[PDB]
């Protein structure tokens, strides 16, 4: 029933993610991120190409810190599934994630590189897409960070490319 109800709510949540009111978009992004933490509702989000497109679009245009963390966090969760990596890939997720590599918000930064690593690992076409978006230069720029786990994931992205 969790999956069926998340499924019905999706079109309205997709609509509110594209709203002009920034408080409406933030609240919808908080909602969708919460839905992405439960496997039944994460399944429903991955099956909606329109919903994944709205999370990508919102993530790359938002100036709201919580909105950026919630939307990148949502993509991070969906990237742990094959039917999730594919939806991110088709919705223009790679260029948006590459832009997020320039975030001063460290959780957005960690979510962005982990999702991109999951993509470079199992998504066909992700290698060339990361390169076309300038991800090679962006990832090299991060090698100056000091967190051990973050540096290793970033170095494996470059070792994969
Ligand atoms: C949310 N956001 C947009 C922008 C920003 C605006 C206002 C406050 C902060 C903080 N802290 C950051 O900075 C970014 C730059 C590049 C990629 C992504 C971000 C990003 O994460």
Author numbering: 144 to 304
Excerpt from the publication:
In particular, loss‐of‐function mutations in the tumor suppressor gene APC are present in approximately 80 % of colorectal cancers, resulting in impaired recruitment of β‐catenin to the destruction complex and WNT ligand‐independent stabilization of β‐catenin. Here, we report the fragment‐based discovery of a small molecule binder to β‐catenin, including the structural elucidation of the binding mode by X‐ray crystallography.
The racemic mixture of compound 6 and 7 showed an improved CSP pattern and was subsequently subjected to chiral separation. Compound 6 finally enabled the co‐crystal structure determination in complex with β‐catenin141–305 at a resolution of 1.98 Å. The ligand was found to bind to a solvent‐exposed pocket in a loop region between armadillo repeats 2 (residues 205–210) and 3 (residues 243–251). The ligand's distinct three‐dimensional shape complements the pocket while orienting the N‐methyl lactam functionality towards the receptor. Thereby, the carbonyl moiety of compound 6 forms a hydrogen bond to the hydroxyl group of Ser246. Additionally, the fused aryl ring forms CH‐π interactions with the backbone CH of Ser246 while orienting an ortho aryl CH towards the sulfur lone pairs of Met243. The meta‐cyano‐phenyl substituent orients orthogonal to the ligand's bicyclic core, binding to a hydrophobic area involving Val208 and Val248. The binding site is located between armadillo repeats two and three, adjacent to the BCL9 and TCF4 binding sites.
